[PDB]
Design a protein around this nucleic acid. Structure first.
Lengths: 168, 94, 61, 166, 180
RNA sequence: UUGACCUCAAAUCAGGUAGGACUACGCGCUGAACAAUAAGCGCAGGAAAAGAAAAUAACCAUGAUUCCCUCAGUAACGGUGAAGCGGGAAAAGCUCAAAUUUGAAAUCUGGCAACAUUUCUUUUGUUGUCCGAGUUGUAAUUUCAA
RNA sequence: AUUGGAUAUGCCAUAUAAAGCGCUUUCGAAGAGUCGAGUUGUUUGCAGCUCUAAAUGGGUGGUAAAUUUCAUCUAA
RNA sequence: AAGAGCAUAGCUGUUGGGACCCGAAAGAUGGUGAACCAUCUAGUAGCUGGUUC
């Protein structure tokens, strides 16, 4: 490894992943994420009952509740979202084993001008989404009371990540 | 078709009906999505050394040597001329 | 006869039973795909056969 | 989807990023066994379009072969000899060094209950599909023995036909 | 090695029992599917008319039957073939039309007529398709008069020189672009 | 101090599966002194292999594969030796990857309790529930004929 | 004695359904150490070796001309 | 230059198939034992011998 790595220096496209976000922003980025955690399977069954009597009484309101604000995940799903430029925050796992899966994503998202960041460990992102593993997370819309601090961390990320890294 | 057998009009004289275009022939057409993807991968992946070498050959007006060297690398003239023209557009774009 | 029958009602409605009570036709028949899986189809082909199946037709002489 | 980027990246095989990643991965694969199970394909896009699905029953084995009969074909036969209870679906290439050709080979469990109930892959369960590469029926094998559709591609001559009335 | 033919009567009898068993299996419907009228592709055979593989998507579109309905009711569909001369459009069209005219579709789900399939079902009969739909050869003309304008048409005025004109067209075209 | 995720072990853990024989006919690899043969090695089935065109042709155009007759002892090569066309036997078409459902992983294996069904107390499932697999992608839709 | 599936019949089903075809105001993603080129072996095919692709592109031919139009097909 | 060939059977001759029968060392492939075996083989035979009222 070490002699092979330094002999032919790590290309910046791959070198960008070994440098990541600081601990503090990671904590507050996570703090917002837990406020939008995807619904639990048990909760899914509960609302499936909720829609059961809803469709009995003419599907009631939009299902039973308002739009399900939560985080967006899945590499294919997020890539389709960022292409449509619907995404407002992008979070990339730092240690994905085949790096080719996200080796293009920072360059893609930079071309779209979207605030993004690299969050340590895939497992933590998976824990956000009740999964064993999440290679990438996306925030595309939140509630209005959450808009203020979401803009704050985006500015903070654009002050201690996105901006400082840029193209090096 | 002059109701005859020979000539650069030959054939049995009929009224040809304009056949539709079939989706197999669609191959080669550019999609804005894939054209965008190719732009992204070109910008992030970079270039192999041999096109690197030929492009300052274009930069210092060493066109003939670069064309010959590009032919040696790929194998056919059309691949070579297709290569150099797109690198030149890259050169003026830069 | 008595013990093995006594075994059979004992293990009736039980998913897994001793190898000496299971079927023994041949090896190939045992490993072959069960009709149920043989009849398994996508619901794409279910749509095809539901909306456009083979018909009964004929011709007038 | 994110797959379109993958093979476009995979096509640029002389890019620095791929050139680095090939060597570090080649150094690693030299230090595992010559054949070893892989938790997930190193090129998910390639395996996916070759018939791999991330579901129980499908399995990937990585292998390397000495360079200097095709390297691709010898990969499958050795894997099939190793994982003798599986039907090997396909194979694809990953890495080289100066001496080795590295391949990842897709196999499907014929007796697994998830494969048997999936109509897209039940065809591999049927007994005619066991040990295809010993018979040369895979993608590389079919191409190797020259089978295709065209003009470009024995015992109908050496036999003598003697009809009833001649 | 040495291929002998002592099974020739036996193999012929096998096919007979194959047809009889097949026909009796699907007795209501005709044993042989219909085929389009198609022309062999070469200067030696192009005058003749033979049976092709299936009717092109142009013809089913014209005949008013979808490419799905046609397969269900015994009309084979060929996608590779494309028909360019609108007679080949025609000759296949009424071929489909008369086939549909003589076709009787038994209603599904206990004989309640759906769409326009049929009402009668006792008319079940298995007929040779080439009887109701024989393939004809080219319609040749007989007893046409005059054409004394073709009399003055002295054959080689076209043949000999237009053949030379075709032969020298490339050189002639090169000449015109040269001095231009 | 604990919990995740990953990599790798271990089980006389639960469930499965592979070997070997036949090999007339199938498909491979190898191959002699004739012959893309005999011998050798590998691997199948009741058939196998091939198969729905990166195929023909130069026509008024043909239309998956296989087989028979013909092409034809012709083209081609230098004794070897086809194929297109035509006639006939038989005919049957299709499935994925490549885009999303993001207002819902809708998908799947297994453990457990019931309901069944059986060539069959020996088979084959279903329902419920639990658990795991799976966002590095299981479903639905689409495969260029579109 | 089972079974072949059709015929009629009886009972559940769920069916707030999906699909085919008039139209498009358009979009159409399409398989890479692969194709290919040179080179060595062997019976154009394949194989080792070094290089290594592209999007009306690519394969294949009638033409031209040694390039061209045209035709046909959509490999890995 | 006012077409004579096509098909079938037989006889005879010739060419090739084991080729009228019998007979030369040898060579290959794969085995067994510490040379032998089985297949290719019914070989090379330009000869020797025999070849039926």
């Amino acid at each position: 490894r070490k002699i092979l790595n330094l002999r032919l220096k790590v290309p910046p496209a791959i070198a960008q992943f070994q440098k990541t976000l600081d601990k503090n922003t990671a904590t507050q980025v996570f703090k917002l994420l837990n406020k939008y955690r995807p619904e639990t399977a048990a909760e899914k069954k509960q609302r499936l009952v909720a829609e059961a009597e809803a469709v009995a009484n003419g599907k009631s309101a939009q299902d039973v509740s308002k739009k399900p604000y939560n985080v967006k995940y899945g590499l294919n799903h997020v890539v389709a979202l960022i292409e449509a430029k619907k995404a407002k925050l992008v979070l990339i796992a730092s240690d994905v084993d085949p790096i080719e899966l996200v080796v293009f994503l920072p360059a893609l998202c930079k071309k779209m001008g979207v605030p993004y960041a690299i969050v340590k460990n895939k497992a933590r992102l998976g824990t956000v989404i009740h999964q064993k593993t999440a290679a990438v997370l996306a925030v595309t819309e939140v509630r209005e009371e959450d808009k203020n601090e979401l803009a704050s961390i985006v500015s903070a990320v654009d002050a201690n990540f996105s901006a400082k890294y840029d193209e090096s | 078709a002059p109701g005859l057998v020979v000539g650069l009009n030959k054939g049995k004289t009929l009224t040809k009906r304009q056949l539709p275009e079939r989706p197999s022939r669609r191959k080669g057409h550019l999609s804005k999505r894939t054209a965008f993807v190719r732009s992204i991968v070109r910008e992030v992946a970079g270039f192999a050394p041999y096109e690197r070498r030929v492009m300052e050959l274009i930069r210092n007006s060493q066109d003939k040597r670069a064309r010959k060297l590009a032919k040696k690398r790929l194998g056919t003239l059309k691949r070579a001329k297709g290569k150099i023209e797109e690198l030149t557009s890259v050169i003026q774009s830069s | 006869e008595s013990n093995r029958l006594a075994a059979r009602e004992a293990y009736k409605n039980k998913k897994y039973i001793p190898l000496d009570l299971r079927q023994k036709k041949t090896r190939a028949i045992r490993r072959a795909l069960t009709p149920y899986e043989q009849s398994r189809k996508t619901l794409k082909q279910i749509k095809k056969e539901r909306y456009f199946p083979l018909r009964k037709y004929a011709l007038k002489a | 989807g994110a797959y379109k980027y993958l093979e476009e990246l995979a096509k640029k095989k002389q890019s620095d990023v791929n050139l680095f990643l090939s060597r570090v991965r080649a150094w690693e694969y030299r230090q595992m066994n010559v054949i070893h199970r892989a938790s997930r394909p190193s090129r998910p896009d390639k395996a996916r379009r070759l018939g791999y699905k991330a579901k129980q029953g499908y399995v990937i084995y990585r292998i390397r072969v000495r360079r200097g009969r095709s390297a691709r074909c010898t990969a499958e036969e050795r894997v099939g000899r190793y994982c003798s209870n599986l039907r090997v679906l396909n194979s694809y290439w990953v890495n080289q060094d100066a001496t080795y050709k590295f391949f990842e080979v897709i196999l499907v469990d014929p007796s697994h209950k998830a494969i048997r109930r999936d109509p897209r892959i039940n065809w591999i369960v049927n007994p005619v599909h066991k040990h295809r590469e010993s018979r040369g029926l895979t993608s590389i094998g079919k191409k190797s023995r020259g089978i295709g559709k065209g003009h470009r591609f024995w015992l109908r001559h050496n036999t003598l036909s003697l009809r009833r009335y001649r | 090695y040495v291929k002998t033919w002592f099974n020739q009567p036996g193999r012929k009898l096998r096919r007979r029992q194959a047809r009889q068993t097949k026909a009796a299996k699907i007795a209501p419907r005709p044993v042989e599917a219909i085929r389009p009228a198609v022309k062999p592709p070469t200067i030696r055979y192009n005058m003749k008319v033979r049976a092709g593989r299936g009717f092109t998507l142009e013809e089913l579109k014209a005949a008013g039957v979808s490419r799905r309905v046609a397969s269900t009711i015994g009309i084979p569909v060929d996608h590779r073939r494309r028909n360019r001369s609108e007679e080949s459009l025609q000759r296949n069209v009424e071929r489909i039309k008369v086939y549909l005219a003589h076709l009787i579709v038994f209603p599904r789900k206990a004989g309640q007529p759906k769409k326009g399939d049929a009402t009668d079902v006792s008319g079940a009969e298995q007929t040779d398709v080439a009887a109701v739909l024989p393939i004809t050869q080219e319609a040749v003309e007989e007893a046409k008069p005059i054409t004394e304008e073709a009399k003055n048409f002295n054959a080689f005025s076209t043949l000999s020189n237009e053949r030379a004109y075709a032969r020298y067209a490339g050189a002639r075209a090169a000449f015109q672009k040269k001095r231009a």
